[PDB]
Amino acid sequence: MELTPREKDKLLLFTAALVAERRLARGLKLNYPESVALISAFIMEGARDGKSVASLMEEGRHVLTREQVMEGVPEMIPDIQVEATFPDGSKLVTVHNPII
């Protein structure tokens, strides 16, 4: 595989997302780290599919709503940022006020 440090680091993010993904499935209100991880992993898969940066900046605001997270969590996340390999190389996706 020849995994570089950055690829191995993203495996940590992906695994953190698996944790949140299951808790949301149970119907729990997600906390701070669970929310950032869930929305971040969504964006990474978005890039893998070849969606544009512009598309993800928008779709990323519809992953979790205010009624799916704990009190005060939406304000603790003014934005979320993550990079992934798009068809045209590494790009940065910034999602402002992701939870509403």
Partner 1 sequence: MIPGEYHVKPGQIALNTGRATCRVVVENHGDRPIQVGSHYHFAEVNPALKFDRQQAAGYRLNIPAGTAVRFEPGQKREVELVAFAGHRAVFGFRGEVMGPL
Partner 2 sequence: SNISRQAYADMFGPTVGDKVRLADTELWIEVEDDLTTYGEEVKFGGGKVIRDGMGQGQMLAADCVDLVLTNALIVDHWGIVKADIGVKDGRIFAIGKAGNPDIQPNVTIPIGAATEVIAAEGKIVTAGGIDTHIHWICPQQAEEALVSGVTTMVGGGTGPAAGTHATTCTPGPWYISRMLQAADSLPVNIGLLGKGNVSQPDALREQVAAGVIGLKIHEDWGATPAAIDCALTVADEMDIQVALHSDTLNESGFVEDTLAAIGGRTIHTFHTEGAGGGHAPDIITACAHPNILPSSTNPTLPYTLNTIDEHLDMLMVCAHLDPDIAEDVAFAESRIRRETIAAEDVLHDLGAFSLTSSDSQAMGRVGEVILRTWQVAHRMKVQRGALAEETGDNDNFRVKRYIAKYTINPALTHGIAHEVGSIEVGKLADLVVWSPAFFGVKPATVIKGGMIAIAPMGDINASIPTPQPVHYRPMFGALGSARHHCRLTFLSQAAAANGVAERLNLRSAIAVVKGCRTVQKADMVHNSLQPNITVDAQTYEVRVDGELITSEPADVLPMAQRYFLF
18 binds, among partner 2, its own copies, partner 1, none (CB under 5 to 8 A by kind): its own copies
- Whether residue 13 contacts residue 41, with contact meaning beta carbons closer than 8 Å, is answered with yes
Residue with tokens 């900046």: 57
Of 4, 27, 75, 89, the residue at the interface with partner 1 (CB under 8 A) is: 75
Contact 38, 21 (CB under 8 A): yes
Alpha carbon distance, N-terminus to C-terminus of the chain: 39
Instruction: Pick one of 36, 63, 64, 99: the residue that binds partner 2 (CB under 8 A).
Output: 36
**Interaction site with its own copies (CB under 8 A):** 1-3, 7-8, 11-12, 14-16, 18-19, 22-23, 26, 28, 32-33, 36-37, 45, 48-49
